[PDB]
Design a protein around this ligand. Sequence first.
Ligand SMILES: OC[C@H]1O[C@H](OC[C@H]2O[C@H](O)[C@@H](O)[C@@H](O[C@H]3O[C@H](CO)[C@@H](O)[C@H](O)[C@@H]3O)[C@@H]2O)[C@@H](O)[C@@H](O)[C@@H]1O
Ligand SMILES: [Ca+2]
Ligand SMILES: [Ca+2]
Ligand SMILES: [Mn+2]
Ligand SMILES: [Mn+2]
Lengths: 242, 241
Amino acid sequence: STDSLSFSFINFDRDERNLIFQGDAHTSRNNILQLTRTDSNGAPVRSTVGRILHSAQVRLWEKSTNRVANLQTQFSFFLSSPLSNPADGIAFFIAPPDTTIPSGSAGGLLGLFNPRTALNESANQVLAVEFDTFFAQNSNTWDPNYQHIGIDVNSIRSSKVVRWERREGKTLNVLVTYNPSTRTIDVVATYPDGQRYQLSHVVDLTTILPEWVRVGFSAASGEQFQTHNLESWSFTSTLLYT
Amino acid sequence: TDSLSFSFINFDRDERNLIFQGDAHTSRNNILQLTRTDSNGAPVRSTVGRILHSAQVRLWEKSTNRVANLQTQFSFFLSSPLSNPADGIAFFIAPPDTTIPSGSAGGLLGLFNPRTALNESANQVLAVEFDTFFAQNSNTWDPNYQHIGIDVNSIRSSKVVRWERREGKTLNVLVTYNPSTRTIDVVATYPDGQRYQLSHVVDLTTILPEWVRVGFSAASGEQFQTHNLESWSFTSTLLYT
Ligand SMILES: OC[C@H]1O[C@H](OC[C@H]2O[C@H](O)[C@@H](O)[C@@H](O[C@H]3O[C@H](CO)[C@@H](O)[C@H](O)[C@@H]3O)[C@@H]2O)[C@@H](O)[C@@H](O)[C@@H]1O
Ligand SMILES: [Ca+2]
Ligand SMILES: [Ca+2]
Ligand SMILES: [Mn+2]
Ligand SMILES: [Mn+2]
């Protein structure tokens, strides 16, 4: 018997009344959620930002009872592009409930940050798990010099990264958990051939985010582009004694 | 799958995902008090309160041809000094913009307007009621005893089972809807194991809109009692029959 909230989509209907759509995010007739803008043929375009949030607010703690949320999310996406350098990536993310798309964020900032404050942790309130396909050091100075999965804490510069291969049109299955007893954020990603990716980072979520949050996804393209297609998503949060 | 599910083991005075209507308030002991009390914690006359979860429940989805099942568990207790305490608490499913109707503080349980309460064509609601007050002068539709009912677009239950109100005791309820049999089941137990069972065939898809909200309603007219919601969990799943 716990206080908990849980939800799941195996498809995205064109009428999803519990989802908040931001910027260019929209749902295709095929019921795949498309985060970034496409042209009249469904091809990817430049300078686009898209995000979704579930409308239900997630309670991260309740100081009253020393309870902290233990959370768990699963999702699958694929990316596609005619380009040899496809940009910029998709992120699962957690932020205050009134979070909106920052100015200047269509590009390497992933729809998550303003460029005047993107490396200033004091100005942000965001945990993100990114899948980052574009790392050119000329514009994505913060990035490691390869493709990567990263854990972002109030910064576009990841606290931890692991090397990762983008695969044109292939579904990545992802599992993210937060264990509040160990304060650990744990990420496991897998392609359909079993090719596997792991990444963890210790951060106390109560020190970085407010009591009530919203959860969802962000994606962007700058001068380079791709489609960012979310296929499925489930989420559970459970308040647990810590 | 597609699913929505939430749990409250008790209620915190800050609950961002609940819609509160009328007299509904959270007590300092984490009980949801649907009807108004004075500064002595005492019930009052002429009160109605309701909660709904803000998350909308989808009852079917054409794109995938799926239909929703549902299941809810809850516990409440009622308290009054009267030998005829009134009026009752109900779990309900209604359109998402549902609000408390005029004249529902009483035998209408905050769910119906007196002018239209018995007219099916006028209402959109499935409710499971715990009705403590049945006198004919005003509760003409009632059987002549305390009862649990399954209400479909009327204050006159489609089906009832005789029930005993037990002053200050927790009643634990489990409601399920099985979309393949099109059946609402109710099981309610007291701490000593006394059990109540009730069942009605109804197709939610032919009665309710695609998207609904769920929660609770309670009221008091001229007779009174506090209505106290202890805990609530709810799940729903879009599946194939
Ligand atoms: O030779 C001039 C100039 O060339 C290079 O900068 C131009 C662009 O190079 C890359 O394509 C990108 O890094 C791009 O940055 C935009 O697109 C990125 C991909 O979508 C995105 O992440 C960025 O946020 C941005 O929108 C550059 O603009 C480079 O060699 C410069 O040093 C050189 O001066
Ligand atoms: Ca990048
Ligand atoms: Ca009655
Ligand atoms: Mn990065
Ligand atoms: Mn009745």
